[PDB]
Design a protein around this ligand. Sequence first.
Ligand SMILES: NC(=O)c1ccc[n+]([C@@H]2O[C@H](COP(=O)([O-])OP(=O)([O-])OC[C@H]3O[C@@H](n4cnc5c(N)[nH+]cnc54)[C@H](O)[C@@H]3O)[C@@H](O)[C@H]2O)c1
Ligand SMILES: NC(=O)c1ccc[n+]([C@@H]2O[C@H](COP(=O)([O-])OP(=O)([O-])OC[C@H]3O[C@@H](n4cnc5c(N)[nH+]cnc54)[C@H](O)[C@@H]3O)[C@@H](O)[C@H]2O)c1
Ligand SMILES: OCc1c(F)c(F)c(F)c(F)c1F
Ligand SMILES: OCc1c(F)c(F)c(F)c(F)c1F
Ligand SMILES: [Zn+2]
Ligand SMILES: [Zn+2]
Ligand SMILES: [Zn+2]
Ligand SMILES: [Zn+2]
Lengths: 374, 374
Amino acid sequence: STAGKVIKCKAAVLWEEKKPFSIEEVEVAPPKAHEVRIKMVATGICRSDDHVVSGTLVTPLPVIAGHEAAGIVESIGEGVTTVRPGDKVIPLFTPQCGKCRVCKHPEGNFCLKNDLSMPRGTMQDGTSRFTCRGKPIHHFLGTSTFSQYTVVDEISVAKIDAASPLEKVCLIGCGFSTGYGSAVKVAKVTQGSTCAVFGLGGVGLSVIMGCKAAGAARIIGVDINKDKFAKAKEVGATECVNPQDYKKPIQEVLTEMSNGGVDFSFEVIGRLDTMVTALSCCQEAYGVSVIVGVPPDSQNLSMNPMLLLSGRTWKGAIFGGFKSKDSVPKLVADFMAKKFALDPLITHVLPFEKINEGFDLLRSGESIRTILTF
Amino acid sequence: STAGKVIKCKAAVLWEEKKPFSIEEVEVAPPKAHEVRIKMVATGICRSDDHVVSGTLVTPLPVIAGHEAAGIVESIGEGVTTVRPGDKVIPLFTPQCGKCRVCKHPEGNFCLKNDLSMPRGTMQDGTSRFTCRGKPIHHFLGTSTFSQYTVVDEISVAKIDAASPLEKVCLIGCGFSTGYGSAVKVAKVTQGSTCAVFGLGGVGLSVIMGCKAAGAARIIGVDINKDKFAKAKEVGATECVNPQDYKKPIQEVLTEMSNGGVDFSFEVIGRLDTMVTALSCCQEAYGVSVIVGVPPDSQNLSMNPMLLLSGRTWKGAIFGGFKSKDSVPKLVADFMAKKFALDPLITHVLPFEKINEGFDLLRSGESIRTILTF
Ligand SMILES: NC(=O)c1ccc[n+]([C@@H]2O[C@H](COP(=O)([O-])OP(=O)([O-])OC[C@H]3O[C@@H](n4cnc5c(N)[nH+]cnc54)[C@H](O)[C@@H]3O)[C@@H](O)[C@H]2O)c1
Ligand SMILES: NC(=O)c1ccc[n+]([C@@H]2O[C@H](COP(=O)([O-])OP(=O)([O-])OC[C@H]3O[C@@H](n4cnc5c(N)[nH+]cnc54)[C@H](O)[C@@H]3O)[C@@H](O)[C@H]2O)c1
Ligand SMILES: OCc1c(F)c(F)c(F)c(F)c1F
Ligand SMILES: OCc1c(F)c(F)c(F)c(F)c1F
Ligand SMILES: [Zn+2]
Ligand SMILES: [Zn+2]
Ligand SMILES: [Zn+2]
Ligand SMILES: [Zn+2]
């Protein structure tokens, strides 16, 4: 029995940037008041996790990364009311405190208790529940899902359907919800519209799914890796284009293809240049462009504000604009009710011990989502 | 007595950047098919007209500028159906052709026949109606209102109430409608919200008017000229701040004053730095920032896209987002019914012949709107 005790378990510790994860024993403290300790079942490999490795994202190291996952509650601290031992749960890398001005706002989801903006790599109380070889190890986004067991604040976990297949619904913890919500909630794609989606990984495919669900008439996938095109078309892309095939800048190509600019464009890569291209390719008077990708830390883009003065709207969002704790259970219920599919996003399923091989599949271009199973 | 004949009249010709206007005789050709020749009655001095002088806005020279005006139809060309001789009219610097994809879109107003994006300085047919000293003179935005007579395309004129006071309603041809619409239509300011308005000239005052009409609880005016604050408070500002009074950047000041960022911000100046400041000062998860000011020609801003990724919305608009020909007559009718006031914007009245003194008043910081009478 483990409740109230330190757990010694296996985790993937990142000791320094640009090195492999080290799969080794860590100690996981029991949960304090308003904390939840979770036995992990499945975690996806998101490009944002690779950004920690590459230094694209800056977060305190050493760290247990991972933020797209699902598991089963092992124990709860004093005062927890929203989950119980045995519950299926998804950790929420964007918390929902319910109390801050953002949580109270009808359209806000980026709760002020987040650990993204100015990452501390801790629990809400500024301490860590992890040690390894006698050293304290940082959390990541309040989730740290690359571990057999994690501890999360209550505001960073959602109870989901007891009958949920956790090896699929883990994707609702980041990539599916982010892409789908970017289309249906943030952009509010309209019926009959033309969309352009830059980047055809797990998140961009989920954007396509949302554009198709919203009734778009045309959905143009854009990627430099043409191997990504067949699955993009399967989930709703009507056309795919590779910028490398053209002598013209792709914003010009997309403006021509759409007879004057697209209704909705999405940057789902993480490059400054594609963010400006994606804005430019939306119609100048009424187009909307949504930034989803995460670019290199502390780098500014350059753009001409006339792109906005003519009437364009430029926005971004974390986690598809979804209020995390309200939305995740409903997304899982909708998945159980066959309202969307997750299988098209899953290209590989590996044991957790093969985490490095899963990252190499992402980096080589082969995979969409690898699901790691504990 | 003049229908079908060349009219000799006075106009204010700009032969060279950074020079006074030359009040001198021009020849105004009669209207061709689907053209309207207007006897001007009143025209306002908008900062955008000054941009032509300063080279902030690049348009072919020599030119007859002016775009905020009202007058009476002298004659119509073949096939005109929407105005008649003797009608009161406002020239529309943003046309409404009614046929293009933007005019057909429920939220578009930047009609594809505009002469703003890539100015030619002509009529729609690529020619000029103006001669001076035997030389062809450019039009400006299809309107060229700094002339006793102008010729406009039919898509660039709206018929307005016969009982309109033209010395007031000229402001509906640019500054009032731009500012008011930027608040009520583009930003969609909400009841109880906090707004920040950068720049307290005629357009920023009109933004304040709209934010107050929308029910904002707090309207923070921002200007480096504290002489602008009294009138800003008269039309609805709850408080005014001068960035020069503060050690810290004003985005930080406004974030503090609004307990974490404003709901709505407006850039109503025309500086790259204040466009980025205005974005930064709106709440990071659900704030909206609207660019209204005209940026200097061909210059790019630098910004960190993390400002958008957290959830901000950034947009801009021409003419307050109003479809020009549908909206201008309705705005005049609402003015007639006292639904908004124009007198607070009018600080000076001069005869047309004193146009250069009018520009001096704007450049000195003294005026809001000078109205010129023909
Ligand atoms: N906003 C959020 O909440 C959120 C959530 C999840 C992921 N992300 C970010 O979204 C991005 C995509 O994540 P993912 O789908 O897991 O990544 P991914 O699976 O690596 O997909 C990225 C795709 O972009 C393609 N690509 C690379 N360069 C270009 C180019 N120049 N032009 C066109 N295509 C190009 C690439 O071939 C690949 O198919 C990353 O930056 C993530 O960090 C953000
Ligand atoms: N988008 C449109 O359709 C549209 C319409 C009309 C005007 N404009 C533009 O809107 C802007 C304002 O026009 P306007 O009201 O006639 O001009 P204005 O009367 O010159 O007002 C601008 C105000 O900005 C103030 N200002 C200058 N620099 C700063 C600073 N650094 N910080 C804070 N305040 C500062 C200045 O003191 C003045 O009161 C100009 O750039 C116009 O070209 C755009
Ligand atoms: O993939 C989701 C995700 C983000 F969108 C970020 F902006 C980020 F910083 C991060 F760490 C992350 F995991
Ligand atoms: O003041 C209205 C106004 C604008 F908003 C412009 F963008 C512009 F180019 C111009 F010439 C103009 F007059
Ligand atoms: Zn992610
Ligand atoms: Zn919150
Ligand atoms: Zn049109
Ligand atoms: Zn103007």
